[PDB]
A paper describes a structure:
The classical model to study retinal proteins is the light-driven proton pump bacteriorhodopsin (bR). These proteins fulfil important biological functions, for example, in visual signalling as G-protein-coupled receptors.
Here we present the crystal structure of bR solved by SFX to 2.3 Å resolution using an XFEL. Femtosecond X-ray pulses at XFELs have been demonstrated both theoretically and experimentally to efficiently outrun the radiation damage processes with the exception of highly radiation sensitive metal clusters. In agreement with this, our bR SFX structure shows no signs of radiation damage in the Asp and Glu residues, where we observed depletion of electron density in our earlier Cryo-structure obtained by conventional crystallography. In this case, even the protein backbone trace differs between these structures and indicates a mobile region of the protein. The structure obtained at cryogenic temperatures thus seems to favour one conformational state yielding well-defined electron density, albeit a slightly different conformation than for the two room temperature structures. Difference Fourier maps obtained from a pump-probe experiment with a time delay of 1 ms are compatible with the dark to M state transition and demonstrate the possibility to use an LCP injector for time-resolved crystallography.
Residue numbers in the entry:
A (entry chain A), B (entry chain A), C (entry chain A): 5 to 154, 158 to 231
């Protein structure tokens, strides 16, 4: 296809596909109720990402948004991906630390706003307003990062506290990159071109989903 | 109206309407917490289907998708219907057998993918790619059917095991037809015309919702 | 901006923003699991409304629908707001009275239909059909009001029964106004112009979210 970024969409599609299949097969025969939850949640993440990457590869998950006197290619399918995958990833962390339901509802709500405002930002036709929505989404992200950092995992089992610590550190570092990439890429300032932006989001997505999942499902904390 | 398929949309609308009202009235005065859940879930299904059928009848739930050198009438409102009604139907089955939450999340996730990929298939403008999404959706269906077949209902009460068995058999046979109808109808190969396709989906929908519901709500398994 | 209704969108945006911030700060340091739920739910409501009001102010949450030989400005962003905020408000009430899950699923389902059918009504191009969807949505509202009125709060604590009583009375009176405003405004009969309609919805929204929240979070019923 004539779009330069197809290769990274293709690699993205393939790597999410492989990860889905790996987690499916790994979770076969697992009978422990708690372990089953973590496998269900963690396998769905790349499964969803696979379908959205495929949509981008085939050209369905793309549209043109006019701003700055140009038709700009915007991959809306990312936000459809992230709307479902990011709360599931937060839920993996929340179930691990046995978080109360009020805290879970706060994280998921804020995540919905973060993703929702991002999408509005992506599709906004007035250039200046795009950054207002970015700012609001980033504020929502910071709230999530604050809750993850400031907790009671050290009060319970060592395997749980240890695995939470690493997945928290991975999450905070990888998630924080997303707003930076948006800002400097096609959606924001347009400093880095769409092909490099697509490469960047692919490394981040695969790392935040497949990499994250491998760390979690190899841990002993997912069992009671 | 000039569309030949209106009569089946009208019949569909009427039969979902009657079924909603029947289940509403039947569930009046029911105070048992478990029974109330099943009535809530089972009454919502035709209520949702009623609204979407009405949308199709009035022409709101229809759009034209260009493929194969023709503007093809696509009823998108079906997928809006099914996105909500199919997980509720799976939940009726899951609550009946007291399925663990990991298994419930797996079924609902896979169902979301099945319906989501179906819709993308429905709206895709490149003919060949429509069948790629059909295949992925069908793969998601098979996963759901595998989980329903391979379970622990025989470990618990006889009324529960008996009612699960029949509703499982109805579900598997009726659900399996949907991908066949899509494939041979307007959305796929275009072998059967839209009016017959609409008739076929109406028989299936009414049977999988109203018929299914009658079997469930007349059973003694819904009570503790 | 050239739209007369901007001032009420601006005031709406500001008042939801202030309310979000007030509830955020008030809920800091609250460690009681039950209280945390109510703060999570109640803070998300204006947070969501803030983002949608902002969308309307900036012009994103608006589209033109042709009916009656005129392009009519329709703020679709309201329905996006209400789809999420109204079930959360019902959940505040349901958790307060310790409602069973069947009843919670009934309320939330009916609320989804109410909002969903409202949106279809809003975007329908055949004038007469707009009122059919209004009628169906209003029927769904009446069901919700019936469940709220006809319950067991008097069986449990006095602070809970007392706070439920006032929030029920506020809810029923404020919610009942919404269908009246739609009917007489731009979406329906077009008797009151869009600027007054926008003023009316803003008073209602702020009262049903911020006012409602203040009453709830100052009560002692949110604690165990
Ligand atoms: C599986 C993929 C993951 C974990 C994606 C995470 C994405 C974010 C944390 C995106 C954040 C954004 C902002 C906070 C600023 C606005 C632009 C977004 C949506 C990229
Ligand atoms: C109440 C209606 C029900 C139970 C509908 C069920 C629909 C399906 C199981 C549809 C399945 C499809 C595929 C697996 C292939 C792609 C086309 C679909 C979405 C019709
Ligand atoms: C936070 C805002 C609230 C509580 C909004 C409530 C809105 C309604 C109860 C709207 C009801 C409607 C009908 C029942 C008739 C159709 C038009 C609607 C959607 C305005």
């Amino acid at each position: 296809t004539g779009r330069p970024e197809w290769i990274w969409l293709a690699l993205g599609t393939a790597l999410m596909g492989l990860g889905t299949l790996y987690f499916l097969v790994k979770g076969m025969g697992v009978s422990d109720p708690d372990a089953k939850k973590f496998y269900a949640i963690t396998t769905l993440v790349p499964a969803i990402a696979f379908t959205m990457y495929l949509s981008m590869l085939l050209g369905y998950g793309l549209t043109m948004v006019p701003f700055g006197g140009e038709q700009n290619p915007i991959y809306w399918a990312r936000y459809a991906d992230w709307l479902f995958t990011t709360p599931l990833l937060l839920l993996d962390l929340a179930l691990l630390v046995d978080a109360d339901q009020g805290t879970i509802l706060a994280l998921v709500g804020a995540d919905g706003i973060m993703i929702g405002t991002g999408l509005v930002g992506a599709l906004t036709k007035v250039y200046s307003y795009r950054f207002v929505w970015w700012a609001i989404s980033t504020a929502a992200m910071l709230y999530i990062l604050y809750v993850l950092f400031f907790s009671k995992a050290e009060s319970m089992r060592p395997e749980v506290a240890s695995t939470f610590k690493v997945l928290r550190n991975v999450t905070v570092v990888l998630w924080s990159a997303y707003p930076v990439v948006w800002l400097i890429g096609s959606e924001g300032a347009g400093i880095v071109p769409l092909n490099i932006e697509t490469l960047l989001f692919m490394v981040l997505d695969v790392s935040a989903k497949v990499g994250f999942g491998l760390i979690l499902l190899r841990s002993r904390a997912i069992f009671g």
